[PDB]
Design a protein around this ligand. Structure first.
Ligand SMILES: [Mn+2]
Ligand SMILES: [Mn+2]
Ligand SMILES: [Mn+2]
Ligand SMILES: [Mn+2]
Lengths: 273, 299
């Protein structure tokens, strides 16, 4: 089975894994390629306080997940002891380190390290953490039935929902205003990697073939409250909170179908890619 | 300390980690960037039986270490619970998967999968596997002193000497004969990566020496020096199996033994361990072309 340890390296029992690692390989990128001087000039002079807050809080919401020690992918070999899944996890774990460094830099160049330190003082961020830490309680569980339960939640929200909300907000400043072009480059490259991390999760879930889908509907409530915190200074004009909820509803449905004025998102991602 | 868990991502307690990860980032490469058709033609037409056997057995010995599930670097966060070392471990773990795929491919192109499956039937390889087992027996130990011993032997053997003998053998065909230039691209890129891995391990060893100088007692230094001296005996016997069909004009075994001994000594100096062999400039300059040949085959 997939939970049994195969000793020989090749042939790969699941050769489709290379499609996900090679996609990460071809999309390889680091934050040191990008210069944020123009974005700081656009930020300082041409963005309203409600627009500054939307950029600040969206990046803080992204950093809450991205700026952390990521250990799920780097340990799937402990649960799927195959050489191809150790490489799948290795490639995703490295990519998450490039992500954590990129949003650690953005927090530094925009001067938001202090707010990131005390981020749990925000009640709604504290609500997403209490949510996330509990629903993913069995990511390290030796029980192979509730570890699967973790990979479902990990792939459709951590990789598909809990971040693409803030990706579209930041990309809207480049789409409709032509601002934050370099930050949107980091955002476009990140969302591409998270799309591959989601498909890799979806791919595995289909290979292991109630508690799930009404656990994930609980996140739409907390993710909607996060948008209230992101737009606490007022709704900006490039995007609206109501459309982002439907964008969140669209992505969850297509995630489960394989196991909208925000249709421009995919087009905007490849333009800034 | 380095063994204590830190929850906050930054500031980094060990910011020099970024020097090693960025080096891997800048030297990033995948084997699909290279094609080996030209090398199969030089192998088929312009290589003797002695040179064929040296190329095949060297790559078999490399694949013996590289084509496997590598798990040491990807789990260094279990012993150094810092966000820095989880990123350092991930960056190195992904790097080994690019290596495992690269030499998996070289075995496939040149048609050596059957001999790699039966590689354990070679007695000198079984001597290396049992020897490497004691070099890795404490890689999961929760004893920080036992795990530090495995970390020292991992960086100076698996990452810095156990493969560089075969690396120089393959590069010698490109420098002196002008053959196997695509294979030399993989070798040079891999040798750069393993150098960063060994230097990254030396950095962690020295940082443990800073915070815990009592861990470097007389017993640890004696066991490491004796285990290391046992390596050159097994690796020199590997050199006999690599040239089991005759001496080749590209390089000599005597230079390769002096090459490994010098690299081992340079490794011990960086972590303040007494030199074992003390190779003279009379001997280790015969393979001094290895560094520049790696850089020439890297661009
Ligand atoms: Mn990420
Ligand atoms: Mn991800
Ligand atoms: Mn390697
Ligand atoms: Mn290595």
């Amino acid at each position: 089975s997939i939970f049994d340890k195969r000793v020989n390296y090749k042939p790969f029992e699941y050769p489709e894994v290379l499609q996900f690692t090679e996609a990460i390989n071809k999309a390889y990128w680091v934050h040191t390629e990008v210069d944020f001087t123009a974005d700081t000039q656009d930020f300082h002079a041409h963005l309203s306080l409600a627009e500054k807050t939307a950029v600040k809080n969206s990046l803080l919401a992204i950093a809450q997940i991205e700026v952390a020690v990521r250990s799920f992918w780097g340990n799937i070999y402990e649960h799927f002891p195959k050489p191809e899944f150790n490489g799948l996890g290795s490639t995703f774990a490295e990519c998450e380190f490039r992500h954590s460094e990129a949003y650690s830099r953005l927090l530094e160049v925009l001067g938001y390290n202090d707010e990131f330190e005390k981020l749990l003082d925000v009640p709604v961020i504290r609500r997403r953490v209490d949510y996330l830490s509990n629903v993913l309680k069995d990511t390290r569980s030796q029980d192979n039935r509730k570890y699967m339960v973790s990979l479902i939640l990990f792939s459709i929200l951590i990789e598909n929902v809990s971040l693409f909300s803030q990706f579209a907000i930041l990309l809207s400043f480049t789409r409709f205003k032509g601002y934050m072009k370099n930050v949107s480059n980091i955002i476009a490259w990140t969302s591409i990697d998270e799309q591959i991390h989601a498909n890799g999760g979806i791919y595995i879930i289909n290979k292991i073939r109630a508690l799930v889908r009404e656990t994930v509907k609980d996140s739409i409530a907390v993710e909607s409250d996060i948008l209230d915190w992101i737009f606490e200074e007022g709704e900006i004009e490039s995007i609206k909170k109501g459309d982002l909820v439907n964008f969140m509803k669209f992505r969850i449905d297509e995630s489960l179908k394989q196991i909208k004025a925000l249709a421009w998102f995919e087009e905007e991602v490849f333009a800034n890619s």
